[PDB]
Amino acid sequence: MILKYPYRVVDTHEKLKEAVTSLQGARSIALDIEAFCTTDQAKQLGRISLVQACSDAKPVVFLFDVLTLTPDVFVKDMQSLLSDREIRKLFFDCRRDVEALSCQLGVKPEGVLDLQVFFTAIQWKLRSVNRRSGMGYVLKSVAGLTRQEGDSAVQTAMTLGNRPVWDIRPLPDHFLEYAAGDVRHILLLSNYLVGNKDVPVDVVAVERLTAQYVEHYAVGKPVITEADATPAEVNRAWLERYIGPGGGCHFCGAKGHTEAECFKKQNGKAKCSFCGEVGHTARNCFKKHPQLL
Ligand SMILES: [Zn+2]
Ligand SMILES: [Zn+2]
């Protein structure tokens, strides 16, 4: 259902006020950004072009045209809901987005939850894995969904990065569709990760871990020293402090997998040489030895 939310372009002051009114009623708001491609293709996001929002208060994806509205008009109406710690702001890897909000818009969001960090926290608690996984892998592992990929032309342009890409006005439909996709996926993901008994990590602990990332990356200037040893992982000391010791396989003792994934466990089960069933040996097989039925 969330996957079918339509988008609405917010590029006037009137539309901005209506969107803010909707978002103020939410408990959670999924957030994302489209920025100008940079010729350097540097860590810091380029000029903010869109901010995207999808909340649990209304079936819609808001595409805020910051370029058109201007950051000053956008921030003035969005600042308080972004600073409102009672409204959860959901991100999938918030690091560069937070830095762009701080540097370009002058705002530090409060009440952030990073769902990519959430998935890694689970991988840490269960397997001592601190790797960050991409959106497609997380959607499949958590929700079972195969992510529809963005328009390949939009993706090619961004990978080339020899032009801004997102400066074009009006935006073509497949650019707007591309821009709306991830915040749908983020709100959908929060349904599986937040308020779920079967998730082996407290949401509050991932809120505290995420807050370390917001504090590190919202400092009003470009971040030089990264929080993580490589871009594709989560600081191990932060995981130990907020999530706890890393886990491992209860069956063989190794880190990196769980007992449900353990090859030694499955391969070590008795397998009947006579009928092939797992769980009993041929000596105990009723089919081979009817004198046992
Ligand atoms: Zn094992
Ligand atoms: Zn048998």
Residue numbers in the entry: 49 to 341
Task: Share the article's original sentences.
Like the G-form structure, the ZFD also adopts an extended conformation in the Apo-form structure. Structural analysis suggested that the extended ZFD conformations are mainly stabilized by crystal packing. Although ZF3 and ZF4 are also present in the Apo-form structure, they are disordered, suggesting that they don’t form stable interactions with surrounding molecules. In contrast, ZF2 is well defined in both structures, due to its extensive interactions with symmetry-related molecules. In the presence of RNA-12U, Arg179 and Phe311 pack against the RNA and adopt a stable conformation, while in the absence of RNA, the side chains of Arg179 and Phe311 are disordered and flexible, as indicated by their high B-factors and weak electron densities. Interestingly, however, the relative orientations between the Exo domain and ZF1 are very similar in the Apo-form and RNA-complexed structures of TbRND. ZF2 adopts an extended conformation in the Apo-form and the G-form structures.
